[PDB]
Paper text:
TS is an essential enzyme for DNA replication. It catalyzes the transfer of a methylene group from the cofactor 5,10-methylenetetrahydrofolate (mTHF) to its substrate 2′-deoxyuridine-5′-monophosphate (dUMP) and produces thymidine-5′-monophosphate (dTMP) and dihydrofolate (DHF). [name] encodes functional [name] (kTS), which shares 70% sequence identity with hTS. The overall structure of kTS was found to have a similar structural conformation to hTS, except minor differences in ligand binding site and conformational variations in some amino acids.
In apo kTS, phosphate molecules occupied the dUMP binding site. In addition, a dual conformation was observed for the sulfhydryl group of catalytic Cys219, as shown in the electron density map of apo kTS. Arg200’ residue in the apo kTS structure was rotated approximately 145° to the opposite direction of the phosphate group and was not observed to interact with dUMP. For kTS, the Arg74 residue in apo and ternary complex did not interact with in dUMP, whereas the corresponding Arg residue in other TS structures was shown to interact with the phosphate group of dUMP. In apo and ternary kTS structures, the C-terminal region (residues Glu334–Val337) was not assigned due to the lack of an electron density map.
Author numbering:
A (entry chain A): 51 to 333
B (entry chain B): 51 to 334
Write the structure that this text describes.
């Protein structure tokens, strides 16, 4: 069976028996708690096909985080605008962080991944040698102690939450090596099933391809674990449309160059082969 | 189907198609990566029955960590010795922590839960007001913002790993409120299927009962998610024995008085009703 049917079955389950809840800000969702799906990375790349996923954004966003940036303006300069709302002075003001220049997202993914536990100043500060470099940590383990059970990169630092533009939805990823293959499990505390989750699956599957490439392994499996899996009520109609569509064969992902470090990738290193999605769906 | 069959199925799957791998310890395991099981908490308590689980240790250990302790001697004094080997001066020296007094585990669960991000000194230091109190954080959300999607307690701080007697296997728990019920998901990076996982299920199910009680909710479900789920090769024969056993109906758990704060529970407050397990299975 097509692995995309896991995601579609998750949508169906939430629509059928999801709890209807309002939060303190007055917005309603349907949700279920606790889900898991598995996507093979071996012969294909799991970029969903029942709608067109924003691959250009997936790639630029991940490279942006990997270099430790917390500046939405540097992502925006690449042509990808998905963090620009969160980096705006008016958004930051709304957060209670008015003391900032446009673009300064606070200690979000890039900072946590490369400098966990360091003292955040701003998005222009030099944090070289400060904090715990989780990316270097996991690359070393995959290379030199691949069977280790602590190959973890974590983005959740509760002491830093009040400084973040947004708290991370992707709390941590764990990696696993067996029989020459690298697998990844993501724990996602909150899954916006309509707008986010297809993009999220692509992000961590890409991360796994990159890590496998750098470490001389082949991609194995991506295990997607969800906490609060939800559908915003305004997304139900477009998702009803999506659910009428039959999945097409997943594309393949090729890496065009020998790359020795997780920091040396560029967007043009990635060749996506035979991606033929159904049309974009605006949620 | 009896919910304990999930755990037994996971054992069978690991034995059948688990990867045979050695660690840096040289000790071999069979393992699989990525599992999930669900245990209802509404009408029973999922204390496993195909072997006798150490309930008294479950209760004492959880209460010890909730109060923020990192002192294995404080647990030992209650009569529960499960952390004594890790808190011994011998083990700690083996870890490169030879300056520690006996019992000083470093910034393990108790410290992370109550003082995340604070600078660890030793097990005797007063950390009042230091770090992020995640226990107070989640209790406040469950009470006042129950549909929030950030009800999380996390024990993984990579910056503190070198100071810990042992790295935590239980990385985080997330809570969820619906229909007057409190549910919990545990992300466990490493599951010792033989010695640890039945005990682990009980720990976080108990935590969920306690939280539900303090916040005026009923317990819902416990969702157990595993990363590296493994069987130690020295555990193969005792687990093959366990697999020949049929689960008995789960016990029930009663809380015997009104408790208004997580820090106020004592082991006196819990009554396990109709626990009828198969005999204890010892494992190396």
């Amino acid at each position: 069976p097509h692995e995309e049917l896991q995601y579609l079955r998750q949508l169906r389950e939430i629509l059928c028996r999801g709890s209807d809840r309002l939060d303190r800000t007055g917005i309603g969702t349907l949700s279920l708690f606790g889900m898991q799906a598995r996507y093979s990375l071996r012969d294909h790349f799991p970029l969903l096909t029942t709608k067109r996923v924003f691959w250009r954004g997936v790639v630029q966003e991940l490279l942006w985080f990997l270099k430790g940036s917390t500046d939405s303006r540097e992502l925006s300069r690449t042509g990808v605008k998905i963090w620009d709302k969160n980096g705006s002075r008016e958004f930051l003001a709304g957060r209670g962080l008015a003391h900032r220049r446009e673009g300064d997202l606070g200690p979000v993914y890039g900072f946590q991944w490369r400098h966990f536990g360091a003292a955040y100043v701003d998005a222009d500060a030099d944090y070289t040698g400060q904090g715990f470099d989780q990316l270097s940590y996991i690359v070393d383990l995959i290379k030199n102690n691949p069977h280790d059970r602590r190959i973890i990169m974590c983005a959740w630092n509760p002491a830093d939450l009040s400084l973040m533009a947004l708290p991370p939805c992707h709390l941590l990823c764990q990696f696993y090596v067996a029989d020459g293959e690298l697998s990844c499990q993501l724990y996602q505390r909150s899954g916006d099933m309509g707008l986010g989750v297809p993009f999220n699956i692509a992000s961590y599957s890409l991360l796994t391809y990159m890590l496998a490439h750098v470490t001389g392994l082949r991609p194995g499996e991506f295990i997607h674990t969800l906490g609060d899996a939800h559908i915003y009520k305004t997304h139900i109609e477009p998702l009803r449309l999506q659910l009428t569509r039959t999945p097409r064969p997943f594309p393949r992902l090729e890496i065009l160059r020998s790359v020795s470090s997780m920091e040396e990738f560029t967007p043009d290193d990635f060749r996506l082969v035979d991606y033929c999605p159904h049309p974009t769906i605006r949620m």
